């Protein structure tokens, strides 16, 4: 899920049933959305679909342009961004 920490915002989600092309991480203003949709036409007789949609608020001290995302081999999606810190 979402974890706000002293020096970063991060979201970690299980997305093992989705290929990278089936995932979308949208950052617009101070909102992050994560979406996934996976469909299988198993056969002549039908299909299965699964999907998810999540939305989170980015704290004001995270520049949304600094948000990035990566996907691990075991299917965990991480979205993260640094918070402004003292120099």
């Amino acid at each position: 899920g979402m974890r706000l920490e002293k020096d970063r915002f991060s979201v970690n989600l299980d997305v093992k049933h989705f290929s990278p092309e089936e995932l979308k991480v949208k950052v617009l203003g101070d909102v992050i959305e994560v979406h996934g949709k996976h469909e299988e036409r198993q056969d002549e007789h039908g299909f299965i679909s699964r999907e998810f949609h999540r939305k989170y608020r980015i704290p004001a001290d995270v520049d949304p342009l600094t948000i990035t995302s990566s996907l691990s081999s075991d299917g965990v999606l991480t979205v993260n961004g640094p918070r402004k810190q003292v120099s």
């Binding site: 990278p20 991480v25 950052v27 990035t68 996907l71």
Partner: peptide
């Protein structure tokens, strides 16, 4: 060993 997931910003 992570794959970068591009951010959609529109």
């Amino acid at each position: 060993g992570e794959r970068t997931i591009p951010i959609t910003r529109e």
